[PDB]
Every structure is written in structure tokens, then in C-alpha cells.
Design a protein around this nucleic acid. Structure first.
Lengths: 84, 178, 119
RNA sequence: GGGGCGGUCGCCUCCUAAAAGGUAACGGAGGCGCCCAAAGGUUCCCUCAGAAUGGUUGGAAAUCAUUCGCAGAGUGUAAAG
RNA sequence: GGGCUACACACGUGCUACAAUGGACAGAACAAAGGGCAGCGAAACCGCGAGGUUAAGCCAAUCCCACAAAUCUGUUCUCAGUUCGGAUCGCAGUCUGCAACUCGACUGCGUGAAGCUGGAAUCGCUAGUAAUCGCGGAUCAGCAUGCCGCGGUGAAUACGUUCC
């Protein structure tokens, strides 16, 4: 990125804000993987829309600046014939 | 000898108050350090295993002795004869002159190292440690040795239990990962 | 051996001689020597008995060989336990920065060999 | 346990041999026409195999520290003693 | 939102090198052509750099993109996986864009693969051609080792139709 600053679409902002202030709801899908993780966002688990299937993702304290959608690879491995 | 005087005045009296002792006089004592070489030959034809033996004279002044194998191995050389590695058993005033170099100089020199030895205790007494660089010992020159050879240290405690053996080491100033 | 960065060589001028240090590069050497005022000096290794020490201190401020290796190691270990995707590229043999795979990129893949035919 | 064919012919260990010894069968299991100037002699010392625990390159094992180990070892080569 | 960028591998086609006719540093010097108003953006200033702040001029033989590079002149390294080469990756920044994870470019710092001229085989070119050095444009928000052009430096050989 650059400066001022990391950019969530902003709906995730109010969502995680309301989820932080109250309710403590867990597991929620999102199509907007472009959004970066935030300190207020910590500890939540989001189903990430790779396209084929949502992949749930827990948020450790260590991850912030990495993109939220980065953790789930759309790519399928490998695929190769004769292993070993 | 400064380390030797140190437990005669500082460590012991503090160690005495930490818990009770039968017959007052009893106190755990360091016995012997055993430094291993191993070398690994790779394979048998070093060709000079003795050149590694000369290197250990720098780490400690006691003369190293090659450890001849007492058993053959199918996976690696060799049947009895043609010794693998070397061993040293420094004692007396040499013991604390060497340990003083270990805490003050050797261990901090290592790159990634910050602290080790947690599960390392036998539950009986003896401490163990691994050493992977000659850079760790100041007396060795960088120009010598070139290729790295491995090293070991095994401090011995008189104490019958690891809980006493550990507490003795902490007052010596021995590092722990915690 | 040696006084600053461990195992600096011999019979070479001081700047390239401490570029070999796992930490300082070329321009950083230009900076530490700019602080030094040595002027190069010395082609071999003969600096000065105390100036070698004051340079040893400035180099000591910079950090640090195998611990710097521990920096990159702890960093990539941070990059694998985090999930992940970047360390995933670090251990697939996949290039990490993002530059295909359909051709070349053998820096991690290695040379040999081949296991396919048609028809 | 007809001959021929096959196998065997000597020495050494155990069992069959039945609590002295001996003791048969083309009975049951194995070895040997050596090897070593040292693995001999003498003197002075030492105690194994395997297990658990801790450990750098050491992985199920090369190396080392420790409790356990009346011998689960070794005794040139094969068995009994 | 992905994918068109897959990844054990094969092939085609380019780029960069494997170095002392060289590398690195300093100084000095010679171009052409093309583009520019939803643009080019000088100069001044800030940042090591990339760029930013601010803003003159230019609808352009006026001004801007813009500095030509090889080269020459000296200093330095003295034949090695190297002060050779830059890969790969880490960290920290930056331009464009609602937005740079997949899957952008650039910079600073750090890391310093392979490669010391390449088997069988194969390609181009008869002179300003081959050899090589830089520049611009179409493309285009951003992204040009590709393509299309511009100029600098600038050869060797051609006996001949036996053979392909």
C-alpha cells in the first residue's frame, strides 16, 4: 500500500465494530477479500470467499498488515501424476 | 579462580537459606565436564582425525583422547579400531576457569542463541549442552579450523534431585530460556 | 578472528574486506568509512592499533551476523505459522514475489529431471 | 533292512545313553585338515550385554554422561562344561 | 470474486551475464527523430533514493518531456565464482488506481542462485550490412527484456558453383 492508509470497503468496519461492542457473533462470510486486517478486528473468524467455497479463517495477533484474503489460496494443488 | 571464590561467599549462603540441609555441611558440587567431538568422519577418511584433536586443545588445555569404537555399525564406519571423536575430563581449578569463560564469553557470542535448557535436565542431576561453533570460544583464531566441527559440555551436580541441581546452576549465572 | 565482523579476509582493501561481513554491504561500507575518514587505506590490512578499535565500535553498532540470520529465520517462521500464503510460497518451491511458473524459475526448482511423454 | 544308484568311511561337542563309566542303527543337531608371535608368559589394573533419561552436525543405532543391570555379555573359530 | 499468470516438465522466442579491449569511481565530450493541453511540466525547495511540495513556460523550429549512451581522460582492483555477474528472498519506502493478496511498476537497505563462453545440432548478415551503445513512440490510469522507429560507434570475407 502507500499512506493514509490501508483501505477496507468500510462495511466490514461497521460490522466488526458492532460485533466488537456487543453480541460477539462468530463466523461470517465476506466477498471483499481486499480489506486489510485491523487491531479492532482481532480474534474474529471470517469465511473467506475464494470463489469455489468459503474458507474460514481465525485471526491471530500476529496478522494485521497481511491482506485478509491472502490467507486462503484459490489455487488447487498440485496437481501432478507420479509423486515419489 | 574468581568464579571459584564466588560460590564460597555468595552462592552457597544464599543456597543454604533456600531450603534445609541435613548435617549442615551438605552442598551440591561440580564434578567433571565431558566435551564430545564426534567429528562424523564422513567417511572414515578424514584423513586426519588427529587434526580435529589438536583443535580441542584450544577449547580446553586438558589433552583430548580419541574414543575408539567398541561396536561395529552397518550404516557407517567402522569396526573396532580407527577411533571416532575425542573426550576431555577437566578438573580442579581448571573447572571454574573454563566455566567462567562459558558464561561471560562463549554462549552470548552465538547468533540466534538467547537461552536454552528447560527440559534438558535428567530429573536426576546432570546438565547437558550442545555446541556448534568454534567462534563460540574466543581463544580459537578464525583463520584456523576453517570447516566447523561440533562440541559438547556436561556439567555434573552432586545433588540427588534436579530441583536442587537446577537451583545450583541459576546462582552460577547459567542462562535459561525461561 | 576477527575483531568486528567475524572472519574478514586478508590482503584486500578494507572496504571490500568488510563488505564480506554478513550485514554491511557496499554503500553501508561507504558510510561507515565516511565516518572513518580512512581514505583507503589500506589495500592490505594495516589500519591503526586504536583506529581499528574505534571502527570496531561503529561496526559493533551495526548488527549482526548469525543473529541477523536469526532475524530472517524468525521472520519466515513468523510467515509460516501466521497461516499462511507467503511462507507457503517459501516452501512450495514456488517463487514468492509473484513471477509465474510455466517456464524458468529454476532458482528453487533445481535442474533435473523429467517424467512425462506424449504420445 | 538284497545288490546297483545315492550317501558315507577320520577327529571334536551335545542328545538319544536309562542320575559310575561304557553303550548300537544309512538315529537326531552341529563343526574341523585351522588360527595367534599375539589373542602367549608374567605383573599391575578394570568389569559386560541390553534399557531408560539428556544431548550439535547423531536418525533405530557410531561418540558421552547417569541411574538400572548375578550376567539377558564375552571367552579366536562349534557345542557342551 | 476468481481465472485467463496454474506447475512435476518439454519446446519456441528475447533479455542479462559468465569479466581486465574489463569492473568501480571522478572529470570531460558528440546526436537524431518523436511526443505534449483531461498534457508536457522547467526552475526553486524537501527526501540517500523513488518521488513529493510548489510553480514559470508551452497548442509548441519559441517551452517542456531531456540528461544522449558507448567513447575519451585519469584514479583504483590484478585474474578469482572475483570490487565478475546479478538471481532469489527479507525489511523499509514510493508512483498510478475505489482498490496493488491473488496478479503492477519503481526505489532504499539487506541477502549474493546458477553461470569462468556451452554436446549433437542450428540461425542471421556482402558496407554503413553484420557487431554493439543509448533515445523516442504506438500501446497506455498504472504496467514494454515485446513491437515499431531514431541516431552514435562501426568491421571481417566473398577463391567459387564441387557440395546442401
Amino acid at each position: 500500500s502507500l499512506k493514509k492508509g490501508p483501505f477496507v470497503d468500510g462495511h466490514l468496519m461497521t460490522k466488526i465494530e458492532k460485533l466488537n461492542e456487543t453480541d460477539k457473533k462468530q463466523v461470517v462470510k465476506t466477498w471483499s477479500r481486499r480489506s486489510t486486517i485491523f487491531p479492532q478486528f482481532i480474534g474474529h473468524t471470517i469465511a473467506v470467499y475464494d470463489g469455489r467455497k468459503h474458507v474460514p479463517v481465525f485471526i491471530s495477533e500476529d496478522m494485521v498488515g497481511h491482506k485478509l484474503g491472502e490467507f486462503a489460496p484459490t489455487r488447487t494443488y498440485k496437481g501432478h501424476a507420479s509423486d515419489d | 579462580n574468581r568464579l571459584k571464590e564466588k560460590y564460597n561467599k555468595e552462592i552457597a549462603p544464599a543456597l543454604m537459606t533456600k531450603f534445609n540441609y541435613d548435617s549442615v555441611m551438605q552442598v551440591p558440587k561440580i564434578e567433571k565436564i565431558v566435551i564430545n567431538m564426534g567429528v562424523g568422519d564422513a567417511v572414515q577418511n578424514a584423513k586426519a582425525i588427529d587434526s580435529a584433536v589438536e583443535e580441542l586443545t584450544f577449547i580446553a588445555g586438558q589433552k583430548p583422547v580419541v574414543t575408539r569404537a567398541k561396536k561395529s555399525i552397518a550404516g557407517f564406519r567402522l569396526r573396532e579400531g580407527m577411533p571416532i571423536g575425542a573426550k576431555v575430563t577437566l578438573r580442579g581449578e581448571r573447572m571454574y576457569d573454563f566455566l567462567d569463560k562459558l558464561i561471560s564469553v562463549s554462549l552470548p557470542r552465538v547468533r540466534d542463541f538467547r537461552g536454552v535448557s528447560k527440559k534438558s535436565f535428567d530429573g536426576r542431576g546432570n546438565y547437558t549442552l550442545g555446541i556448534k561453533e568454534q567462534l563460540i570460544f574466543p581463544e580459537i583464531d578464525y583463520d584456523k579450523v576453517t570447516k566447523v566441527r561440533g562440541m559438547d559440555i556436561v556439567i555434573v551436580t552432586t545433588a540427588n534431585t534436579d530441583e536442587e541441581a537446577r537451583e545450583l546452576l541459576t546462582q552460577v549465572g547459567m542462562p535459561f530460556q525461561k | 578472528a576477527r575483531i568486528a565482523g567475524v572472519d574478514i579476509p586478508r590482503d584486500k582493501r578494507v572496504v571490500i574486506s568488510l563488505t564480506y561481513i554478513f550485514g554491511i554491504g557496499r554503500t553501508t561500507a561507504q558510510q561507515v568509512l565516511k565516518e572513518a575518514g580512512v581514505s583507503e587505506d589500506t589495500r592490505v590490512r594495516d589500519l591503526t592499533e586504536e583506529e581499528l578499535g574505534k571502527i570496531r565500535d561503529i561496526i559493533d553498532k551495526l548488527k549482526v551476523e548469525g543473529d541477523l540470520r536469526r532475524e530472517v529465520s524468525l521472520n519466515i517462521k513468523r510467515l509460516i505459522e501466521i497461516g499462511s500464503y507467503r511462507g507457503i510460497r517459501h516452501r512450495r518451491g514456488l517463487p514468492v514475489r509473484g513471477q509465474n511458473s510455466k517456464n524458468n524459475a529454476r532458482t528453487r526448482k533445481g535442474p533435473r529431471r523429467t517424467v512425462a511423454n506424449k504420445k
